Amino acid sequence: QVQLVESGGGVVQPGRSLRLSCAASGFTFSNYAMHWVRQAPGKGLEWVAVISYDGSNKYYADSVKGRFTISRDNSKNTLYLQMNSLRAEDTAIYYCASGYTGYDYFVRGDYYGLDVWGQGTTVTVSSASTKGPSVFPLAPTAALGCLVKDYFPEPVTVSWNSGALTSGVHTFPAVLQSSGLYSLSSVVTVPSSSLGTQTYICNVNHKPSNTKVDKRVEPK
Amino acid sequence: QPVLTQSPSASASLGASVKLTCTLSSGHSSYAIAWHQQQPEKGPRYLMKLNTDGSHSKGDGIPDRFSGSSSGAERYLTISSLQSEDEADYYCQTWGTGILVFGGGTKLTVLGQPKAAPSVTLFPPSSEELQANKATLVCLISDFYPGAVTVAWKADSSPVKAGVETTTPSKQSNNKYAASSYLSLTPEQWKSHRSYSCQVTHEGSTVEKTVAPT
């Protein structure tokens, strides 16, 4: 039972570099071709690069040729993707993949199969500085919540009443504004008549900036 | 290099069947392809390779409800007795010279729960935010099925295009969908208008919420 596990993802500023890795277990790695595929947030899959079993043949998607470089260490069963001169359009999840090496009569040469997918690693390319969020109350069966405003990079976690409150909680996905900073909301729907007797505190945690914020939400 | 044309979306009811279609550009009429499945929040999974003669090679662990067939420049993925888990993005993929080509993908929604119109709560900017010289409007949409909505804002009655962001829907812990929309303003812009509208269009039908400074 084969497994491919990627590492080396994260946040870097445009024009910098980054080496992705792909750990392969469960098959004779040095005999299979190896791919890189990426998915921009909310975009489709885009094929990036492929490398043959011995490393003597490499092919690249047009959009990365000159900047990226695929390689492999067969002694370590590891696949690499060197990204250079990174652009904000290189922000995506990067998967590695493996396959057989077949002969195709319509190409009259090798094709490289892609039949096993990795789990993924995330790469964020931005001209933004680490920054904690501002937390504002969305004061009010009724709904109330927390606006987690203008942070970078992801992620931020939101528990309510220190986790003691979970039914009716929904934390939305982040949004990326034209400022380059992220925002999300966490909302909870509550029994209407609980507002005078219970307290609602959302716990916003942003490890990238050591920011932890407890914000109490009261009625207007 | 060859190009693959998938229809952008398709749906059928749970228990029904679908035939996802991928068409090769004419110049590569006879090229073989592969089918990949991407379920929500997950990585991709290899389904099968599909040849020009109709013959397929499945990966291991692929249910028999998935079969491949072939015709002209077209390739078909067929899924019988559709289940809840089959809701996913299906990407056909092909080969060129060394390089590989994906299609745009097909989001297959399997209607497996009664329809649901959306809950729309619109929050004016907190007073704490106004003291920070910012003003954001938070429009939350929840408890709808299926998750496809269009959001339009209005300043008084004139639509607003600038300063709008919106999430793509996502299912709640009770198997229904939800999405949020934001409208950024300056404090002046907030004060200098009578009302603001959040207008949510869900399958022709429309919900409207309006707030005002006071």
Place this chain on the structure above:
Amino acid sequence: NLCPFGEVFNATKFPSVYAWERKKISNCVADYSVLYNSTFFSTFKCYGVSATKLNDLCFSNVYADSFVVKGDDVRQIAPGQTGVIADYNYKLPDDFMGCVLAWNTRNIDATSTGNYNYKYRYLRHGKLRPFERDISNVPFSPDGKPCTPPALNCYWPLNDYGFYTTTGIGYQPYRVVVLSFE
């Protein structure tokens, strides 16, 4: 000293997958032109070698393994596969180094009436080691105790493929040659 690659893909008769046959090919000059001048190989997969740069490989021996399976079973002729064919009939090693070729042979291995001459082993106690071969035909019983079918927990371990000219593409017969490189 010309290699007999032609004869292997040529052969009028192919064996059943449980009784797969091997041809040792050595001390000869190789002509792989049969692989490229006959565009019907629906399966042409290689491992640790390149299908197209193939004669630039200096081998001591090549081994050619021949057998028949149905189409939906061809996927099990690959390293690390599982299923009845891969676990009880023909097993590639994990570091298999060579290619796997397969082509539809309905026009010669199927009939209108049914061709039940090809058999595979569907019951066995252990899984096969890579390149192992089991040509026995002892009745299978979970307990290892001798028995006689039909009886308490007792079946003959080989089953016939039924090849008809007129069935789904995945039920038609496929000839398979496995090329193994030392």
